[PDB]
Structures are given as C-alpha cells and as structure tokens.
C-alpha cells in the first residue's frame, strides 16, 4: 500500500465517563472508576465490585422499542460508535456509503441476555425464549445494527479475541482501509459481562481481585500486592479514515495509525510465558509494520491487567524489545483506573493512546505503591506525566495467548 490511515472520530463509554472527554478528564486526574456493583446482589460472591458504566441512557441513542431487544453490550457498542461517527463529522451519502464499514467486536457478547433467556427456558420451556434473543445477543450485531442505522455498506464484521478484541478490531479495520476495500471504518469493541455468569465465571477461575474493602485500590498493575483483575464494562469506537479522504473533507485528524502487529504465545490457555516472548514478537511486528525502530517509541499504554503472571511478562517483553530505551519511554496501565474492560479494553486504550499524543501527557498507573521485582521502568506511578510523545504503542493480550499491538503517531 501507500494508503495512510488516520483517526478522525472517537467515542466511548467507560467506568470514568459516558463519553471520551469525561473519561479522559478522569484518567488525567488519576480517578478510579471502580465501585461496589449496584445492579445485582453480590453479597454471596467473593468479588462484589467492578467498573460499571454509570447513568447510561440508551434513549440518547435508540428508541426504547429498539433498545429493549438488545443486550447491554450492543447498546454500549452502538453508543460508542454513534459518538465516534458524530465526532468525525463524516456525512454518509450514496457516493460514499459503500466505502464505509464497521468492525466492532466483543469478547463474550450477550451474556446477560443469554442468562435471562436460559432462566425462561428452564422455568417455562423453549417457547418463552424471546424471538429477539439471537439478533439481540450475538457479537456481530453491533456492526449489523450500526450499518443499518447509518446506511453503511462497506466491510461489515466482528472480531472476538477475548481481551485482545478491541485491538484486533482496530488493526484489521486499518488493514481494510490500507488495502483499498474501504475509505472509512468504525472500529473498536464493547463488553458487559457483569452478570452472575460473568462474575461467577472469572471468579471460579480465581482470576479476580477480591479486595472488597477498598475497590479503588484493587487494580494495581505491577504492584507487589496485586491479586487479579477488576472486571469493567463499556465500549470504545474510533473512526479510521484514509488520509486523502480525510484531508479532502477537512476532517479534524487526531493521530495517524501507522502499525499493527499480531502474535500467538502458543504457551497456555490463560497465562503468558514469564518472559513475555509472544508479546515481544507482537510489539516488534507492529514496529516493523510501522517502519519504526524501538527507540522511536515514547509512550506504551500497557495491557497491564493487575495479575501476577501477566504484568511481569509484559515488563520482560518491553525490556527485551526496547533494550536500554526501555528506561527512556514511559509506560502505563490505565486499567489501574478503568479496570479491565475485556473486549473493549483495547478500544478504550487506543483512544487513551491517541489522546496521550494530542495532549502530550502520559496517563498514570495509579495504585503503584510498591513496584514488584524487576518493575523498574518509568511506569508513570501515581500522577500523569506531561512529556514529549511522538509515538504511542498500545498492547492487548488475551486468553489463548492471542496478542495485538497498535502503533500511533502524531500526525504531521
């Protein structure tokens, strides 16, 4: 290709806000989005807190008719997608609608809806399943409903790669544009796994923090007292656009997407190898894709989930890739504040990466009181750090050892 890809529009729901500016304000203030869960009774569970979207009003986006048919993960993905498209200023016409597609994924999809239809099935039999159960619960219906609501006729699909989803969604959408199969893609991810099955499922694996006494301190990536991830909900969407297309309509450009890498660990179903060899291969692939040397990276938005094995692997991988420069770049985990948004994590963190470029500021890793053995990089502990950022990398790693990296650059 010679086709450059830029970001023209962003949208988000997160535990820190109902839109990108409100969430980013929270990020730069070191605010926690984590609180006891209000929407179900978790008094019998080992983890009773997480990152909820607070005060979401679906009727800002959808009729009550439409919304009642859709699982919350679809509601969230559509909210982020609609926010991003509005933010971009793009006008969809007959001249361009075939060139505009969508790639919004989810890691687990409509778990709450499935749980509710299961209850109906078991209590009252299969005729009590909703007729809207399938199209309201399956992962590709963020892409599907968005394309229908906006008349988008370009490439229409959905990734599901666990915690990597939102990163792969964005990366593969950028490939579509570079290849010429679209001029614009709305890409990202959404998740709402905070139901009994979800919390129970992650809890049954002993994967979650159980710091119920201080939920805001629970997510502490690279801290020696970390004890598992914090489950969070929400969504992130970006409008990706071919550069000449964006220039021709006078779009506001946030940043350029210059590289995308993937790898597989081929190691274990849930733990990475302790040296993060797969993550290293992934990061190198993304830099090679971008035509960048490691020394050109200024900011890493780490995956950094607050797990024992995961966090130290990612340090090892950054040291392996970056060598001495690993001590010059700034690296932080915004999951310290947002928790782990699962399929949406990579989408929200890409947005935070783009804003780090816009605002020339590395967001903090809050709660990093006692860095663990070998966690001796600049992890932007405690407080946001204004600094020079030309290039920002964002990593996501997922169950199965599936890895993704995005590389963004200031646009000039």
Ligand X SMILES: Cc1c(NC(=O)c2cccc(N)c2)c(=O)n(-c2ccccc2)n1C
Binding to a second copy, residues 91-130 (CB under 8 A): 97-98, 101-102, 105, 107-109, 111, 114-115, 117-119, 121-122, 125-127, 129-130
Q: Using the rule CB under 8 A, which residue among 21, 264, 308, 323 binds a second copy? A: 264
Scanning residues 367 to 406, which ones bind ligand X (CB under 6 A)?
A: 397-399, 401
Residue 265 binds to a second copy (criterion: CB under 8 A): yes
Residue 40 binds to a second copy (criterion: CB under 8 A): no
Task: For residue 142, give the 3-state DSSP assignment.
Answer: helix
Query: Which residue, 29 or 207, has its beta carbon nearer to ligand X?
Result: 207
- Edge-to-edge strands of the sheet including 234-242? 156-157, 100-105, 184-191, 234-242, 5-13, 255-264, 402-409, 391-398, 299-301, 330-332
Residue 379 binds to a second copy (criterion: CB under 8 A): no
The least CB distance from residue 129 to ligand X, in Å, is 14
Contact 406, 165 (CB under 8 A): no
Q: Using the rule CB under 6 A, which residue among 167, 219, 305, 306 binds ligand X? A: 305
The least CB distance from residue 386 to a second copy, in Å, is 36
Largest CA distance in the chain: 64
Residue 310 binds to ligand X (criterion: CB under 6 A): yes
Task: Using alpha carbons, select from 224, 405, 249, 266 the residue that is nearest to residue 322.
Answer: 405
Query: Which residue, 67 or 207, has its beta carbon nearer to ligand X?
Result: 207
Chain-centre distance for alpha carbon 295:
25
* Pairing relationship of beta strands 100-105 and 184-191 according to DSSP bridges: parallel
Scanning residues 268 to 327, which ones bind a second copy (CB under 8 A)?
A: 268-270, 278, 281, 285
Contact 219, 336 (CB under 8 A): yes
The least CB distance from residue 27 to a second copy, in Å, is 28
Query: What's the rounded Cα separation, in Å, for the pair 184 and 103?
Result: 11
Q: Which stretch binds ligand X (CB under 6 A): 25-33, 60-68, 284-292, 303-311?
A: 303-311
Helices 345-359 and 20-28: crossing angle in degrees, nearest 10, is: 70
Contact 105, 189 (CB under 8 A): yes
Scanning residues 203 to 232, which ones bind a second copy (CB under 8 A)?
A: 203-206
Q: How many residues bind a second copy (CB under 8 A)?
A: 84
Phi, psi of 379 (to 5 degrees): -95, 15
The least CB distance from residue 343 to ligand X, in Å, is 5
Query: Which residue, 255 or 312, has its beta carbon nearer to ligand X?
Result: 312
Contact 98, 154 (CB under 8 A): yes
The least CB distance from residue 12 to a second copy, in Å, is 22
**Helix/strand/coil (H/E/C) assignment for every residue in 191-232:** ECCCCHHHHHHHHHCCCECCCCCCHHHCCCCCECCCCCECEE
The least CB distance from residue 402 to a second copy, in Å, is 4
Query: What's the rounded Cα separation, in Å, for the pair 122 and 314?
Result: 44
Task: For residue 329, give the 3-state DSSP assignment.
Answer: coil
Scanning residues 5 to 44, which ones bind ligand X (CB under 6 A)?
A: none
Residue 202 binds to ligand X (criterion: CB under 6 A): yes
Scanning residues 321 to 360, which ones bind ligand X (CB under 6 A)?
A: 342-343
Q: Using the rule CB under 8 A, which residue among 237, 403, 405, 408 binds a second copy? A: 403
Scanning residues 245 to 274, which ones bind ligand X (CB under 6 A)?
A: 272
Q: Which residues bind ligand X (CB under 6 A)?
A: 107-108, 134, 138, 162-163, 202, 207, 229, 272, 303, 305, 310, 342-343, 397-399, 401
């Amino acid at each position: 290709s010679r086709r450059r890809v830029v970001i023209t529009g962003m949208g988000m729901l997160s535990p820190l806000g109902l839109d990108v500016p409100s969430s980013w304000e929270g990020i730069l203030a070191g605010r926690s989005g984590i609180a006891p869960i209000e929407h179900m009774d978790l008094s019998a569970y080992s983890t009773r807190f997480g990152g909820s979207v607070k005060g979401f009003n679906v009727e800002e986006y959808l009729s009550a008719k439409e919304a009642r048919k859709l699982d919350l993960f679809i509601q969230y993905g559509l909210a982020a997608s609609f926010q991003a498209v509005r933010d971009s200023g793009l006008e969809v016409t007959d001249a361009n609608r075939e060139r505009i597609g969508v790639s919004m994924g989810s890691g687990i999809g409509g778990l709450t809806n499935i749980e509710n239809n299961c209850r109906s099935l078991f209590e009252q039999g299969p005729r009590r399943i909703s007729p809207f159960f399938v199209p309201g619960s399956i992962i590709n219906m963020v892409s599907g409903f968005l394309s229908i609501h906006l008349g988008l006729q370009g490439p229409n699909y959905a990734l599901t790669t666990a915690a990597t989803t939102g990163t792969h969604s964005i990366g593969m959408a950028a490939r579509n544009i570079a290849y010429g199969e679209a001029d614009v893609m709305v890409a990202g991810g959404s998740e709402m796994a905070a139901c009994g099955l979800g919390l129970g499922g992650f809890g049954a694996a002993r994967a979650l923090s159980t710091r119920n006494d201080e939920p805001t301190r629970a997510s502490r990536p690279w801290d020696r007292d970390r004890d598992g991830f914090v489950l969070s909900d929400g969504s992130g969407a970006l409008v990706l656009e071919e550069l000449e297309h964006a220039r021709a309509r006078g779009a506001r450009i946030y940043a350029e997407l210059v590289g995308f890498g993937m790898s597989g660990d081929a190691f274990h179903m849930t733990a990475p190898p302790e040296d993060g060899a797969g993550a290293a291969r992934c990061m190198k692939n993304a830099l090679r894709d971008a035509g960048l040397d490691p020394r050109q990276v200024d900011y890493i938005n780490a995956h950094g989930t607050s797990t024992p094995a995961g966090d130290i692997a990612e340090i090892a991988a950054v040291k392996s890739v970056f060598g001495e420069h690993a001590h010059a770049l700034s690296m932080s985990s915004t999951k310290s504040m947002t928790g782990h948004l699962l399929g949406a994590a990579g989408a929200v963190e890409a947005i935070f990466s783009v804003l780090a470029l816009r605002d020339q500021v590395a967001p903090p890793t809050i709660n990093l009181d006692n860095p663990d053995e070998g966690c001796d990089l600049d992890l932007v502990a405690h407080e946001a750090k204004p600094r020079k950022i030309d290039v920002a990398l964002s990593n996501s790693f997922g169950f199965g050892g599936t890895n993704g990296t995005l590389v963004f650059r200031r646009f000039a």
